[PDB]
CSV table of C-alpha atoms and ligand atoms in Angstrom, one decimal:
chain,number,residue,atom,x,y,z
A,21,UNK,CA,48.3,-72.9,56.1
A,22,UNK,CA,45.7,-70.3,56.1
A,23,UNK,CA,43.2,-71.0,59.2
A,24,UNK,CA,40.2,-69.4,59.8
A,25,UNK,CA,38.9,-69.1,63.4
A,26,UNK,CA,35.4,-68.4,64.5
A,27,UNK,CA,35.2,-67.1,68.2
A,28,UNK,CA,30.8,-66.6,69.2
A,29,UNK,CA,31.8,-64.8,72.3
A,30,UNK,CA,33.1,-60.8,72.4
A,31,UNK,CA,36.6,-60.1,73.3
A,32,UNK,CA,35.0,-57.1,75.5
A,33,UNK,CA,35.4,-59.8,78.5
A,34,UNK,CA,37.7,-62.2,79.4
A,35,UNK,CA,36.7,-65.8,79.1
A,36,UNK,CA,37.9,-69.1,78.2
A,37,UNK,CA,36.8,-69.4,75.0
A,38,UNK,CA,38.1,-66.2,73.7
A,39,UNK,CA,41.5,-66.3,75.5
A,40,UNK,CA,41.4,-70.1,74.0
A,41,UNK,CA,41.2,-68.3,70.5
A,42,UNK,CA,43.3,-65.6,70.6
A,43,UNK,CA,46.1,-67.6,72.2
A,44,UNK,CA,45.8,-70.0,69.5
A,45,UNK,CA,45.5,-67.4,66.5
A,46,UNK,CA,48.9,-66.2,68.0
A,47,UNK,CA,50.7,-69.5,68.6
A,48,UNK,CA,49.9,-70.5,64.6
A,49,UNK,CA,51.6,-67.3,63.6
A,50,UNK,CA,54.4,-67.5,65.6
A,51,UNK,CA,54.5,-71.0,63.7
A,52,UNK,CA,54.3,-68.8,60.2
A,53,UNK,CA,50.7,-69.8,59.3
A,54,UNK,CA,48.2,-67.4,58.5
A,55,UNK,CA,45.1,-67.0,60.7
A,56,UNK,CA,41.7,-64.9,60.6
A,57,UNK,CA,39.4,-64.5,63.9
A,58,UNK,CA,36.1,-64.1,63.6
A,59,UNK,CA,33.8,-62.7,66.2
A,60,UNK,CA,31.1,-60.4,67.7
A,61,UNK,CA,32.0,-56.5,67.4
A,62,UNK,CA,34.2,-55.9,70.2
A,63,UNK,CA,34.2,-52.1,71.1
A,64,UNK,CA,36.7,-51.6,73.8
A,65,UNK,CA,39.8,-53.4,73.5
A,66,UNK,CA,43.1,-53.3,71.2
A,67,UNK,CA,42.9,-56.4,69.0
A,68,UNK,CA,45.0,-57.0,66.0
A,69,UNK,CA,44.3,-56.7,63.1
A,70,UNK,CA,43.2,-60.2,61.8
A,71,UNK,CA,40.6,-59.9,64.3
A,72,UNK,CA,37.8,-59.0,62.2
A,73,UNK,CA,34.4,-58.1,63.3
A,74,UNK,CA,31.2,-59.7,62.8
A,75,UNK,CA,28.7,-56.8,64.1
A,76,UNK,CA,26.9,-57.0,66.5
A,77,UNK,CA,23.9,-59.3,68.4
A,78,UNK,CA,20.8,-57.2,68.9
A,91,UNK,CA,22.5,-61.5,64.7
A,92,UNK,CA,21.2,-59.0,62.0
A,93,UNK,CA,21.3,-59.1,58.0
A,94,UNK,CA,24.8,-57.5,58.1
A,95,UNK,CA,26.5,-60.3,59.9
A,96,UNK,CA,24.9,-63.0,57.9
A,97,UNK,CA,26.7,-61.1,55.0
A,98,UNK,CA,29.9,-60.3,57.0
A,99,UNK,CA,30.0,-64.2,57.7
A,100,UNK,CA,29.6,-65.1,53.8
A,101,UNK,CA,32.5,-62.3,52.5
A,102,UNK,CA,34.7,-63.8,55.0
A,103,UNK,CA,34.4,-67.0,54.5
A,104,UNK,CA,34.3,-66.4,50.2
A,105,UNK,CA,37.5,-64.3,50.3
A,106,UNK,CA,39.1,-65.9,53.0
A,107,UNK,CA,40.7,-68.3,51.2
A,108,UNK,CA,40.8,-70.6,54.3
A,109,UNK,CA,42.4,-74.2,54.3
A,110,UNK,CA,40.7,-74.7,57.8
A,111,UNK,CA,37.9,-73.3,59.8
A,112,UNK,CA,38.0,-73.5,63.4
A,113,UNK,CA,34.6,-73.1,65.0
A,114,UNK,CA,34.4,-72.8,68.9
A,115,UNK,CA,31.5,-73.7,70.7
A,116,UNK,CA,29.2,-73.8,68.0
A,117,UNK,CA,26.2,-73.5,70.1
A,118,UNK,CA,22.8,-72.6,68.4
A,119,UNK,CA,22.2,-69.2,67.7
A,120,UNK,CA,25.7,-68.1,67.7
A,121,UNK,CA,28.2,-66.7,65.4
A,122,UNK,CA,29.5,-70.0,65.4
A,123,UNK,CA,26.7,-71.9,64.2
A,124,UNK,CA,26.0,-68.8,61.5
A,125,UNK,CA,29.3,-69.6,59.8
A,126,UNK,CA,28.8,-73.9,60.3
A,127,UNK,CA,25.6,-73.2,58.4
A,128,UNK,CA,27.3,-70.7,55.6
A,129,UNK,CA,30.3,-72.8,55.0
A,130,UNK,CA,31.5,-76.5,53.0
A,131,UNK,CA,34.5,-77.7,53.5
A,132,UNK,CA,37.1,-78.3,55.9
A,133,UNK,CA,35.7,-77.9,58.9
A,134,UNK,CA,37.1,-78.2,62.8
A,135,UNK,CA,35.2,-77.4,65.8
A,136,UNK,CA,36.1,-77.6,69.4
A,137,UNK,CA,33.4,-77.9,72.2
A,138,UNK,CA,34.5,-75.9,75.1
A,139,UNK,CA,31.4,-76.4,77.2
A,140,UNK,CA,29.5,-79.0,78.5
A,141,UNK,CA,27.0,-81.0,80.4
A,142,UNK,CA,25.3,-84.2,80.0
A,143,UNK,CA,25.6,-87.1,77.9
A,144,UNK,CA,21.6,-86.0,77.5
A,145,UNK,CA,22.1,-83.1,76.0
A,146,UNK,CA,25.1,-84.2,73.8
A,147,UNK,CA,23.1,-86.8,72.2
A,148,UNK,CA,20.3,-84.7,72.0
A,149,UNK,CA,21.6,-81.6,70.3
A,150,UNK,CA,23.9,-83.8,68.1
A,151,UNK,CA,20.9,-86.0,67.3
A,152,UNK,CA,18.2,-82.9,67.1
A,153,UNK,CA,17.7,-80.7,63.9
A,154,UNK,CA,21.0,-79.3,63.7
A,155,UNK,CA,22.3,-82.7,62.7
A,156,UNK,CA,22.8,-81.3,59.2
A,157,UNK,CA,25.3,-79.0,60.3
A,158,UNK,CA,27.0,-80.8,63.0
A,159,UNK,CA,27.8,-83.8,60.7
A,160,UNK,CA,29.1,-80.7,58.3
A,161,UNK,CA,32.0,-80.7,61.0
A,162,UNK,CA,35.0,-83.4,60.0
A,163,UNK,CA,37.5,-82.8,62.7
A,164,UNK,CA,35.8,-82.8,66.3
A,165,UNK,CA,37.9,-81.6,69.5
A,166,UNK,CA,36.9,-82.1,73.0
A,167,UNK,CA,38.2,-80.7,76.6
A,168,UNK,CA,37.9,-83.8,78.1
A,169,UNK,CA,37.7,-87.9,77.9
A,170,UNK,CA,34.0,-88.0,78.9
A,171,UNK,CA,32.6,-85.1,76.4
A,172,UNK,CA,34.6,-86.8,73.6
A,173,UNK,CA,32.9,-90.3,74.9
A,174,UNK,CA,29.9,-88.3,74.1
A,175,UNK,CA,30.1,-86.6,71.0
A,176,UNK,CA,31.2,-90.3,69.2
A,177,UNK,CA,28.3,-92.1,70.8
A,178,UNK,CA,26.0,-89.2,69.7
A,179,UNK,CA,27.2,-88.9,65.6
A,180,UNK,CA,29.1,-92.2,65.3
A,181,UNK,CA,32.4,-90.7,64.3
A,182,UNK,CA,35.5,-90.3,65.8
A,183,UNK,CA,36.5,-87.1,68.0
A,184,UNK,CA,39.8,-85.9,69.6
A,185,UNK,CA,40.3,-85.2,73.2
A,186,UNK,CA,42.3,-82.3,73.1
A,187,UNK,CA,42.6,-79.8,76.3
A,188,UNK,CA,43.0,-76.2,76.1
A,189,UNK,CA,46.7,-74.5,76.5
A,190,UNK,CA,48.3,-71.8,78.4
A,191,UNK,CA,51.4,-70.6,78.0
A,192,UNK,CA,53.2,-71.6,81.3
A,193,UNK,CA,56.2,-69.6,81.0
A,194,UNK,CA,54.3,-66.5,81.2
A,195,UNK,CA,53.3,-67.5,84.9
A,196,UNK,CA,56.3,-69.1,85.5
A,197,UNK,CA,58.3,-66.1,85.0
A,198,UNK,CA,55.6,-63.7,85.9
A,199,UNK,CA,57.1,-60.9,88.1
A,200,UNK,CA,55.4,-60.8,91.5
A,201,UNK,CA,53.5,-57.8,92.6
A,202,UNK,CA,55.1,-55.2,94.7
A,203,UNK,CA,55.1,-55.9,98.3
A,204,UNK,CA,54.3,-59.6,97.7
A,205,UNK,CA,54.1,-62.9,98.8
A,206,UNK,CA,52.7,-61.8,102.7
A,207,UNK,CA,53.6,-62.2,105.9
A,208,UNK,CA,50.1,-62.8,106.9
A,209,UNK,CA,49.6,-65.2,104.0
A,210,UNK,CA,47.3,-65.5,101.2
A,211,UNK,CA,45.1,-66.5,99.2
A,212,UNK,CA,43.5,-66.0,96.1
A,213,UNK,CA,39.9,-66.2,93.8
A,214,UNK,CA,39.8,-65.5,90.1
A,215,UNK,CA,36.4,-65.1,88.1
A,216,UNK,CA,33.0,-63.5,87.8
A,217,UNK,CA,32.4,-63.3,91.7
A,218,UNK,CA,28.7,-62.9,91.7
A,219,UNK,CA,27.7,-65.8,89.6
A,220,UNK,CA,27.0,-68.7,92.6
A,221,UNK,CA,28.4,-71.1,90.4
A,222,UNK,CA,32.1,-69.6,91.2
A,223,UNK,CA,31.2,-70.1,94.5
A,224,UNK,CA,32.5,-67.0,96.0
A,225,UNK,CA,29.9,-67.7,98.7
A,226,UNK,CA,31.8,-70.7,99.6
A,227,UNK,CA,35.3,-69.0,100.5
A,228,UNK,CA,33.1,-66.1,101.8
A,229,UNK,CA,31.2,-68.7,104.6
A,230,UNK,CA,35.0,-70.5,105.5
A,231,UNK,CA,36.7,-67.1,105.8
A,232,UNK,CA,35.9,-66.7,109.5
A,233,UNK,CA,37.1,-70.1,109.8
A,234,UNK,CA,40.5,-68.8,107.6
A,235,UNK,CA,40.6,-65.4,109.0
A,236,UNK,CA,40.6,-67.0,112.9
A,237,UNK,CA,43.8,-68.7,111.7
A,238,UNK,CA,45.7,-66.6,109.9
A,239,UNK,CA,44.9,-62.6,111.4
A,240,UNK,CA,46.3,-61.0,108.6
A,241,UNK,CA,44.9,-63.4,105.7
A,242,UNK,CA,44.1,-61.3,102.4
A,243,UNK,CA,41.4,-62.4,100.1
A,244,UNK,CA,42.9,-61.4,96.6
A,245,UNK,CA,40.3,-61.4,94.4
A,246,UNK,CA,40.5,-61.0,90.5
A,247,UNK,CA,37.5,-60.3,88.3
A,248,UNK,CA,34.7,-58.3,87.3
A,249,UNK,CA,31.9,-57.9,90.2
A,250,UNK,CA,29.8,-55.8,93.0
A,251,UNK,CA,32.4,-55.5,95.0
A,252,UNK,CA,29.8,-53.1,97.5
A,253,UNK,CA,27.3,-56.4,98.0
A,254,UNK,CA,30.1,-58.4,98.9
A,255,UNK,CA,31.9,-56.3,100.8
A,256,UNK,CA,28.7,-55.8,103.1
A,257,UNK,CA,28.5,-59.6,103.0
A,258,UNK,CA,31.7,-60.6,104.4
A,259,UNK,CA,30.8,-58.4,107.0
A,260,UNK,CA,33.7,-57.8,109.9
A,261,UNK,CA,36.0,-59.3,107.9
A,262,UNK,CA,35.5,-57.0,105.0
A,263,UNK,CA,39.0,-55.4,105.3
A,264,UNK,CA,40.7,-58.6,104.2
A,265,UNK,CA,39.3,-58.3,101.1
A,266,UNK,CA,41.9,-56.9,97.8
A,267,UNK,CA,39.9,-56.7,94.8
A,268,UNK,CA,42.0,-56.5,92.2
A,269,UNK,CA,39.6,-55.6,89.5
A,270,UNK,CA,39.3,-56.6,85.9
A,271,UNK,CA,42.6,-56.7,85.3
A,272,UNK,CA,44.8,-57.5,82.4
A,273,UNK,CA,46.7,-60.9,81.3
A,274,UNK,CA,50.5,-59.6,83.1
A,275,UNK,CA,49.0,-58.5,86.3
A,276,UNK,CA,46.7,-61.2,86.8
A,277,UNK,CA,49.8,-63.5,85.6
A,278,UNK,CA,51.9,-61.3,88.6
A,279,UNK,CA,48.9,-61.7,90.9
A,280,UNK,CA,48.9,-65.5,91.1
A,281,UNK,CA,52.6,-65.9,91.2
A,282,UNK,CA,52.5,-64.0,94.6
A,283,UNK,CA,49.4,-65.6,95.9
A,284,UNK,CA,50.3,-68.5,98.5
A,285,UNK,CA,47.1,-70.6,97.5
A,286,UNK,CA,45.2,-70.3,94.5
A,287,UNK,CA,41.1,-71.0,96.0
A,288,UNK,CA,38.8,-73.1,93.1
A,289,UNK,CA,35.5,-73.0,95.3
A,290,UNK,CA,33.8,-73.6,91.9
A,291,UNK,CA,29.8,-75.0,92.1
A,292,UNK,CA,29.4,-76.6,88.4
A,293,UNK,CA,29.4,-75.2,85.1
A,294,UNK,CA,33.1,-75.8,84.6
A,295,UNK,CA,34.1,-78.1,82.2
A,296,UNK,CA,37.7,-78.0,81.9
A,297,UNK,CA,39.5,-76.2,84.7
A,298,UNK,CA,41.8,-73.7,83.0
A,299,UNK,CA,42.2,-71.0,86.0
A,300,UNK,CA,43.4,-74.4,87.9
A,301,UNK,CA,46.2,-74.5,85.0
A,302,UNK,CA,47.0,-71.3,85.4
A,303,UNK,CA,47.8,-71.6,89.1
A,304,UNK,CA,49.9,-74.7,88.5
A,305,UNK,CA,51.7,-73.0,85.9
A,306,UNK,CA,53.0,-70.0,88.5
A,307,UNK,CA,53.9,-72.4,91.1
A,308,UNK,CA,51.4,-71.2,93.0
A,309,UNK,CA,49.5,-74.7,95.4
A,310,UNK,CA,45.9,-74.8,94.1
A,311,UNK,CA,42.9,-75.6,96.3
A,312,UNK,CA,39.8,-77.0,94.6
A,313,UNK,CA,36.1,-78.0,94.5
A,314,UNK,CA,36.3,-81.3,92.8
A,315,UNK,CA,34.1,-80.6,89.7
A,316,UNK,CA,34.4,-83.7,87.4
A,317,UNK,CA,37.0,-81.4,85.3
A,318,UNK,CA,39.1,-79.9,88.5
A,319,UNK,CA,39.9,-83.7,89.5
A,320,UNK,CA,41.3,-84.3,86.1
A,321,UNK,CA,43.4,-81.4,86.3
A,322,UNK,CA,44.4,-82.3,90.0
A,323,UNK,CA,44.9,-85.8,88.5
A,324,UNK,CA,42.9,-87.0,91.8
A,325,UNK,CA,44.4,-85.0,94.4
A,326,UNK,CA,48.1,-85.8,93.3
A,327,UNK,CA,49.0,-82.3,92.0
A,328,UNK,CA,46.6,-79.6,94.0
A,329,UNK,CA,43.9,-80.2,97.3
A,330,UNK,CA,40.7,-81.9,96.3
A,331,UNK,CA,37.4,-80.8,98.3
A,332,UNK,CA,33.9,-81.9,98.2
A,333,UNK,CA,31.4,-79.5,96.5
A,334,UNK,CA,29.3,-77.0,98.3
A,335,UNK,CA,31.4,-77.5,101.7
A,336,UNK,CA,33.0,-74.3,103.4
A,337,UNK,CA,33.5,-76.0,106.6
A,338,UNK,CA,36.0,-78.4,104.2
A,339,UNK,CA,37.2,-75.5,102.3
A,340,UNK,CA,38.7,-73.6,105.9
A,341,UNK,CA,40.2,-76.6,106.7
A,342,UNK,CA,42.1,-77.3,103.1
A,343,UNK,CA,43.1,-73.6,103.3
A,344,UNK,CA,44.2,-73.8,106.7
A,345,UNK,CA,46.3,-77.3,106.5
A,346,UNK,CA,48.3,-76.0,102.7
A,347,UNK,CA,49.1,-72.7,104.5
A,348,UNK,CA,50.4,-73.5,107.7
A,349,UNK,CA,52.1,-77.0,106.6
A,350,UNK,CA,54.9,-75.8,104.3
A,351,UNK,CA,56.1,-79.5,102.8
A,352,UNK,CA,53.0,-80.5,101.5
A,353,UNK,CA,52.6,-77.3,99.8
A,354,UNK,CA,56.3,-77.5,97.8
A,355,UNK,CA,55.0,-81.0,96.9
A,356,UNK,CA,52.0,-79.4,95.9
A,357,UNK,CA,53.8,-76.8,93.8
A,358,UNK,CA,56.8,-79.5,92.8
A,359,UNK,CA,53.8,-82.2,91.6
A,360,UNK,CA,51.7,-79.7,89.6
A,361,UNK,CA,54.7,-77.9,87.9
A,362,UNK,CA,55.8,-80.7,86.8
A,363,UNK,CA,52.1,-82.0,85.6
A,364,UNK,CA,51.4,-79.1,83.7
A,365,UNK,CA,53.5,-79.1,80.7
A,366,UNK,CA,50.6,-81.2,79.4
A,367,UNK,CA,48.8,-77.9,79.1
A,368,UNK,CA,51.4,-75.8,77.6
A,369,UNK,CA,51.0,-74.4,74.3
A,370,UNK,CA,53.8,-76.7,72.6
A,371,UNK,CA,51.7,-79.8,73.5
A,372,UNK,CA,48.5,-78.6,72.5
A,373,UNK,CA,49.1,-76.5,69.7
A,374,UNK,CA,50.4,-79.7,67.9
A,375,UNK,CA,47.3,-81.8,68.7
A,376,UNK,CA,45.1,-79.0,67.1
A,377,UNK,CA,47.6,-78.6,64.1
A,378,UNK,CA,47.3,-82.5,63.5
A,379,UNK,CA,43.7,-82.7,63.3
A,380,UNK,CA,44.1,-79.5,61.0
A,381,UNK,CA,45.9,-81.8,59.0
A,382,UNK,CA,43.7,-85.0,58.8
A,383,UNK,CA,41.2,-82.4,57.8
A,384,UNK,CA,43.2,-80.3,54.9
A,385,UNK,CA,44.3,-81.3,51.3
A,386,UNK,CA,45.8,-79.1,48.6
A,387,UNK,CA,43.4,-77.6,46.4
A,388,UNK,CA,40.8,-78.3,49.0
A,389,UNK,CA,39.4,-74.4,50.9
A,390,UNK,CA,36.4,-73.9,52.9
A,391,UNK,CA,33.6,-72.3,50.5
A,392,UNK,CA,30.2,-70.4,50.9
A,393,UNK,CA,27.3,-73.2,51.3
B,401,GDD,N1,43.2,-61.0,82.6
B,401,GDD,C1,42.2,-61.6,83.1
B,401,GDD,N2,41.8,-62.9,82.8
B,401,GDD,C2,40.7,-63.4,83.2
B,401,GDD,C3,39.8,-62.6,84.0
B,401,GDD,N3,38.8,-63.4,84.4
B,401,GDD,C4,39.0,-64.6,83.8
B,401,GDD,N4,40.1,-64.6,83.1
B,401,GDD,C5,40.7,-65.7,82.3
B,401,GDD,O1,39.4,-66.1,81.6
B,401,GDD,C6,39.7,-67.5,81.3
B,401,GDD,C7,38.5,-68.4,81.6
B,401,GDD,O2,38.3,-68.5,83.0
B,401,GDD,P1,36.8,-68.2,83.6
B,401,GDD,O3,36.4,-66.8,83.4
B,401,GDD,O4,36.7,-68.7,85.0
B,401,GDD,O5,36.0,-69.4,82.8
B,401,GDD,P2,34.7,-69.1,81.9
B,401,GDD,O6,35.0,-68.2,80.8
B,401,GDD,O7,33.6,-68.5,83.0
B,401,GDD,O8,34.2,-70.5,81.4
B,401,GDD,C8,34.9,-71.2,80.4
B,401,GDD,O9,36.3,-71.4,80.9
B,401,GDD,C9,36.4,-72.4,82.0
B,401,GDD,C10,37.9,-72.4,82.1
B,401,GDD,O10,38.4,-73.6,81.6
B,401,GDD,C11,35.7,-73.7,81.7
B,401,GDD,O11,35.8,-74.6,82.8
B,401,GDD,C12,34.2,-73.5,81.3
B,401,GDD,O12,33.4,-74.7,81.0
B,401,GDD,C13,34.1,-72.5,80.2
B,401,GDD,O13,34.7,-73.2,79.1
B,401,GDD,C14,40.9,-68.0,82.2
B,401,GDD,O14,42.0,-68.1,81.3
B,401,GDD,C15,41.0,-66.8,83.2
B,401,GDD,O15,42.3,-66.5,83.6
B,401,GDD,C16,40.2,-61.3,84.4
B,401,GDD,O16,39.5,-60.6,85.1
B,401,GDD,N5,41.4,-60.8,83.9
């Protein structure tokens, strides 16, 4: 097979959807099949080379172009939209192309506004899409009440030997213990603010606590914030996919004070995979991948007070924590790539037929 993928996001930034794609991409051709990725120009980072650029958003004449030569020479036996949201690069090549078509829905919120989007004017193109992949039960529910036809649950991978076997950082784990926060800081829906207000509680407990934080942020505002307790702050920065892989194997607790906007919880996965006891915020999607407080600490929402406390009682209580860790190791090889690579090639294959490629519109 020849797969085309279209990614709507840059790769100048981590994310889920691109690390999604590019994990995938790679996975397919260690398999033998051919794949193309689509996506925004992506200036400052080494991508190979069937990553192809779609210019830039400011999307312009050119890209509309660069969509319809790619897709015409492509040659492609499957597209693989992500997240076709509208605008996006996504929904420019949904519009431009016939064919076999997949897409998978990383993000959502409401049955509302899966109906109603389904349902709206881009019904045309949506129905356009034959092979329909969800991140979880509920958003599938959705998507087949909304269209009337059958879509896949499928949830994204990880490759869980590369945490698993992930060297630890030097000087790591700590005697004073810690713990550790992964994402865009200064968005509220991470919730830094959470784990910022039960630090005193934390610190209080464990004198010589750090805060290990990976991701892109003001680290100045927050540092301020935090106040006293400032110094027990580690902010790793943006870092790459081995350290931040090394990072959470030598974290103690892996902290998921998360508001909303998450609809699949993939940093969660990526703690389990290390070994590494996760802590959570009980999103819909972080309870499916606790599977209800059996394989990582469940917390209500916007509740530091609760947060301290769940920190407090993995750290200090060492059984529950290798339970923790035993539980969730075993719970997600339902993530690993194996798994989920063949539930994506599968619906590439109810899709596909000899003689049958994607076309221009
Ligand atoms: N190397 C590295 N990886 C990072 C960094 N920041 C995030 N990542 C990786 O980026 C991916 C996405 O995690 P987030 O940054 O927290 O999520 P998102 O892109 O803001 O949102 C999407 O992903 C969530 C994860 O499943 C979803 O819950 C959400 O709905 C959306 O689909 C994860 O694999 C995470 O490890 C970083 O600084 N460095």
């Amino acid at each position: 097979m020849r797969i085309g993928m279209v990614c709507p996001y840059s790769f100048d930034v981590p994310g889920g959807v691109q690390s999604h794609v590019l994990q995938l991409a790679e996975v397919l051709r260690d398999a033998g099949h051919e794949v193309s990725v689509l996506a925004p120009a992506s200036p400052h980072v080494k991508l190979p080379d069937y990553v192809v650029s779609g210019g830039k958003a400011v999307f312009g004449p050119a890209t509309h172009r660069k969509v319809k030569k790619w897709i015409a020479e492509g040659d492609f036996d499957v597209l693989h939209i992500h997240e076709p949201n509208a605008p996006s690069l996504s929904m420019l090549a949904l519009q431009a192309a016939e064919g076999p078509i997949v897409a998978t829905f990383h993000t959502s919120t409401t049955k509302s506004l899966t109906l109603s989007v389904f349902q709206g004017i881009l019904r045309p193109y949506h129905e356009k899409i034959i092979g329909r992949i969800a991140v979880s039960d509920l958003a599938r529910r959705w998507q087949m009440e909304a269209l009337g036809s059958d879509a896949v649950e499928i949830p994204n991978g990880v490759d869980v030997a590369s945490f698993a076997d992930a060297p630890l950082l030097d000087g790591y784990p700590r005697e004073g213990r810690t713990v550790l926060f992964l994402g865009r800081y200064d968005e509220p829906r991470k919730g830094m603010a959470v784990l910022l207000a039960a630090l005193p509680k934390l610190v209080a407990r464990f004198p010589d606590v750090e805060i290990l934080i990976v991701g892109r942020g003001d680290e100045d505002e927050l540092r301020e914030q935090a106040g006293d307790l400032a110094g027990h702050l580690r902010f790793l920065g943006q870092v790459d996919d081995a350290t931040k892989a090394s990072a959470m194997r030598s974290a103690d607790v892996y902290c998921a004070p998360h508001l909303g906007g998450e609809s699949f919880g993939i940093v969660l996965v990526e703690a389990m995979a290390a070994g590494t006891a996760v802590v959570a915020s009980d999103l819909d999607a972080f309870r499916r991948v606790l599977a209800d407080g059996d394989a990582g600490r469940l917390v209500p929402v916007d509740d530091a007070d609760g947060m301290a406390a769940a920190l407090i009682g993995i750290l200090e209580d060492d059984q529950l924590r290798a339970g923790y860790v035993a539980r969730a190791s075993e719970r997600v090889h339902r993530y690993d790539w194996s798994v989920v690579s063949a539930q994506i090639m599968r619906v590439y294959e109810t899709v596909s037929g000899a003689g049958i490629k994607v076309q221009v519109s």
